[PDB]
Amino acid sequence: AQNPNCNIMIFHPTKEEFNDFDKYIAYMESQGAHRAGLAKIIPPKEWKARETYDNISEILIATPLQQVASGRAGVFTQYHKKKKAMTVGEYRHLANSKKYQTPPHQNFEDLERKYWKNRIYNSPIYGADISGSLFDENTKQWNLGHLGTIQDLLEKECGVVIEGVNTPYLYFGMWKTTFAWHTEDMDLYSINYLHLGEPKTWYVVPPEHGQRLERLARELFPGSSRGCGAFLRHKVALISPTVLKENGIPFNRITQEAGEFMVTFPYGYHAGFNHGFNCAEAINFATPRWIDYGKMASQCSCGEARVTFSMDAFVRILQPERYDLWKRGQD
Ligand SMILES: O=C(O)CNC(=O)C(=O)O
Ligand SMILES: [Mg+2]
Ligand code: NI
Ligand SMILES: [Zn+2]
């Protein structure tokens, strides 16, 4: 078996290998990359996402989110308080202000220590889930707005045509902005490109050990667990690497820098934080290997999760027994 320790693998495709997206994902899996839950892909030196990022300041962040924490330094939840709209130029200025800027630090490890020590005492503002793309339309390789759709994948594999669309989302981050422990909707893959700015640190649990993380989360967030059998779908819970280690949860960590792709694999729980002002683009995707994960994916039906239009068809076709209950949660 390839990659039996479930390490995060890093790939350096050639420009020739970068032509066929599906083929390269399959190649990574042939080397055991999926066992980690997360892989890094460094594009060939000849590739670029777009010419320059000099003209992005007029993008609107319609609903910036202030991420307010509750709990203890290593075990906390966050809720999202809506703020007034601001442009990316305004957001960048805010990120760099004394109140929100990255503190002096020695290296990534020092900054990581500061993050887990101090995160809960601040409330950074995130521009998340903004529909759009920063890939040049002429970028032919690994253009996250030109991927084969999940709906077409499901049709190719299972023969059923379904409604729905999926398009990329932009994320504008600042120091301490946080993504909570989660797997993707329907345990899909995701791919994330860091366009510009400061790094993003990721934590990930191997898919084969995801239920260990779930069990710990139930113990650490007991009220939330009683409220919903899939409350990590709410994407609000954080658990530090120290607490994971104390509880014997297998995980890995890696820092993504500007110009690098990360792929998360089906049922790979992940969480992380931004180092400073940055912009990432991400989208969900599927492969034939995803279908069995989609069939088995947990669902939130308590009403909190509330997801995209396109998830309806996924649940309807892959999980018909769960569909009625899930849809009640939607409404
Ligand atoms: O970048 C973020 O804030 C969150 N991204 C993801 O969870 C992802 O790409 O799957
Ligand atoms: Mg602009
Ligand atoms: Ni994700
Ligand atoms: Zn729920």
DSSP letters along 147-208, please? Answer: SPPHHHHHHHHH----------EEEEE-TT-EEEEE--GGG-EEEEEEEEES-EEEEEE-GG
Interatomic CA distance for residues 74 and 54, integer angstroms: 38
Nearest CA owner, ligand 1 atom 9: 192
Total domains in the fold of the chain:
1
Q: Are 65 and 128 in contact (CB under 8 A)?
A: yes
Interatomic CA distance for residues 275 and 267, integer angstroms: 25
Distances (CA, A) of 238 to 56, 101, 105, 234, 249: 31, 22, 23, 12, 14
Amino acid at 221: F
Interatomic CA distance for residues 280 and 275, integer angstroms: 13
Nearest ligand, CA of residue 61?
2
| Rg, Å, the chain Cα set | 19
Amino acid at 121: Y
Beta-bridge partner residues of 196: 279
> Which of 198, 264, 269 has the most ligand 1 atoms within 8 A of CB, as the residue to mutate?
264
Dihedral, 234, 238, 241, 242 alpha carbons, nearest 10: -140
Interatomic CA distance for residues 150 and 119, integer angstroms: 36
At residue 41, the 3 state secondary structure works out as strand
User: If you search the block for the tokens 């709990």, which residue do you land on?
Assistant: 71
Who contacts 144 (Cβ-Cβ below 8 Å, separation ≥6)? 133, 135, 168, 191, 193, 281, 282, 283
Query: Cα(192) to centroid of ligand 1, in Å?
Result: 7
CATH code of 195's domain: 2.60.120.650
The sheet that has 200-205: what strands, in order across it? 178-182, 269-274, 200-205, 252-256
Tokens of 46: 């000849």
For this PDB entry, the determination method is X-ray
Positive or negative, the CA dihedral 198, 203, 208, 214 is negative
Characterize the bridge pairing of strands 178-182 and 269-274: antiparallel
CA 167 to chain centre: 15
Nearest CA owner, ligand 1 atom 10: 190
Question: For 260-277, what is the HEC assignment?
Answer: CEEEECCCCEEEEEECCC
Final resolution, Å? 1.3
Tokens of 309: 């239009």
Interatomic CA distance for residues 292 and 303, integer angstroms: 25
Interatomic CA distance for residues 171 and 131, integer angstroms: 9
Closest atom of ligand 1 to CA, residue 178: 3
At residue 9, the 3 state secondary structure works out as strand
Interatomic CA distance for residues 139 and 18, integer angstroms: 12
Interatomic CA distance for residues 230 and 119, integer angstroms: 25
For residue 275, give its domain range.
1-331
**Count of CB atoms within 10 A of residue 16's CB?**
8
> Which of 125, 130, 166, 190 has the most ligand 1 atoms within 8 A of CB, as the residue to mutate?
190
